[PDB]
Design a protein around this ligand. Structure first.
Ligand SMILES: OCCn1cc(-c2ccc3c(c2)CC/C3=N\O)c(-c2ccncc2)n1
Ligand SMILES: OCCn1cc(-c2ccc3c(c2)CC/C3=N\O)c(-c2ccncc2)n1
Ligand SMILES: [Cl-]
Lengths: 257, 257
């Protein structure tokens, strides 16, 4: 059992926000990230969202999934994980403009695919894969986190997820789409749709297939096979998109170069 | 459930000989380490050993503990952990004589201690802590492995363990003593009793109180507080040995210098 008795966890600095709560740097047998819900009266919807996340996290054990360490129910609801020093991929690529070399980029892509595979093989769909939830531990190791919207943001959401025509538009291919946006971030160093200033228009056009990411913006030393892989993972039609084994095989084969 | 379904684990080249099994490099959602029972049919004592080890590992979720990924029963009894890219601490210190700076040595000491502290707070006694079950990984991160003898190699063995003339000869302090030997290795670059070439005699003389590690052999840049800490962790009477929270407090303090 993974309940952590109160009084053990030391909450320090507020780092930011997560899915269903607030992120703090903490102390519990060392540094730990803590996502905590600042709420005196935890509504039953909240409990559920919490129960589910914990439930999913217990089922994960892999270097590329942010290591779940336990949970707390008092004084508030909390999830505890390993601390990753470094920052999110979003932070590296778009805030402090870190310039990685291509080999490092592909490695980030491989690792990111490595963990997504694990997740799916364990019949888990993330539903919220983006460069913010990918944490770059010691600037070497990839850690996918935030399994709040998980089940067993606009730019990374596939067209079918935007339309919400189906009952449940999420699938393994929806995460694949998201991951392809990550490859786009990796290889362009940029955010898609940067020449559009209007969120609504983006949402509407992606949903209708009018809009798609401009792959001509990749670095000149991005392998052709990697642009191809991007475009497979980015296909507007769900069933035309690769699954992670194929994606992995692809990147690993691309790697020798 | 952590039972890996038959087939998925691919075993590669043999790495060395672990505890109650053999260790191979592997593949199962990325590189992994595999410890497998290199036998055909298991004696029912070999079998509950495996059970127990899996029972301890599935209670470990911490960055300084080698990450359990799963177990298999078919083909054979096997344990899957994360693969660590570096090597054993042992290997660095006494084979390739890696020249770490003090800061890094102290860091390794803290991490190792951080891990040992995690265990003991969950009532786990390792019983085989040596620099060979300390795997470095991206050379910054420490991973304590091999829970073959874990419950709830003589150079790291406390004198009361050597004698086997008590209740439970093993204790938190038996572990603390073994950790003291690791500090020694960090601070000397070498094993204790290196000028003695007979295993039986060392057993006899540590058991009797005739032999103890020579602390004059430490670095000149080794802080007095580490030497002093080492000598408390190495005290023959176990009730005079600090526990890990104190050990941590000591190291974090002298690390602020
Ligand atoms: O990206 C915005 C800033 N930021 C958010 C987090 C974060 C996000 C989600 C979750 C946790 C931490 C912990 C548990 C969790 N979800 O369950 C982190 C972080 C993650 C790992 N180590 C250090 C910091 N940084
Ligand atoms: O020290 C002897 C050489 N050596 C032994 C192991 C090892 C030892 C025990 C166990 C595992 C691997 C996996 C399962 C286990 N115990 O349950 C390793 C190793 C560990 C992690 N990554 C790479 C290599 N090197
Ligand atoms: Cl790690």
């Amino acid at each position: 059992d993974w309940e952590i008795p109160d009084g053990q966890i030391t909450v320090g600095q507020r780092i930011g926000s997560g899915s269903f709560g607030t992120v703090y740097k903490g102390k519990w047998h060392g540094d730990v990230a803590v996502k905590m819900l600042n709420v005196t009266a935890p509504t039953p919807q909240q409990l559920q969202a919490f129960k589910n996340e914990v439930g999913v996290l217990r089922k994960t054990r892999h270097v590329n999934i942010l290591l779940f360490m336990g949970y707390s129910t008092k004084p508030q609801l909390a999830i505890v994980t390993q601390w990753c020093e470094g920052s999110s991929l979003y932070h590296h690529l778009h805030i402090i403009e870190t310039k990685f070399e291509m080999i490092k980029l592909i490695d980030i892509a491989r690792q990111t695919a490595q963990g997504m595979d694990y997740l799916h093989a364990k019949s888990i769909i993330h539903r919220d894969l983006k460069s913010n939830n990918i944490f770059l531990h010691e600037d070497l190791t990839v850690k996918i986190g935030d399994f709040g919207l998980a089940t067993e943001s606009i730019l990374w959401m596939a067209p079918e997820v935007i339309r919400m025509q189906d009952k449940n538009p999420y699938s393994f291919q929806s995460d694949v789409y998201a991951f392809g946006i990550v490859l786009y971030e990796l290889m362009t160093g940029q955010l898609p749709y940067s020449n559009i200033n209007n969120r609504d228009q983006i949402i509407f056009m992606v949903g209708r297939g009018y809009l798609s990411p401009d792959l001509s913006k990749v670095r000149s030393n991005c392998p052709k096979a990697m642009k191809r892989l991007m475009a497979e993972c980015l296909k507007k039609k769900r069933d035309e998109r690769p699954l992670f084994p194929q994606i992995l095989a692809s990147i690993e084969l691309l790697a020798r170069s």
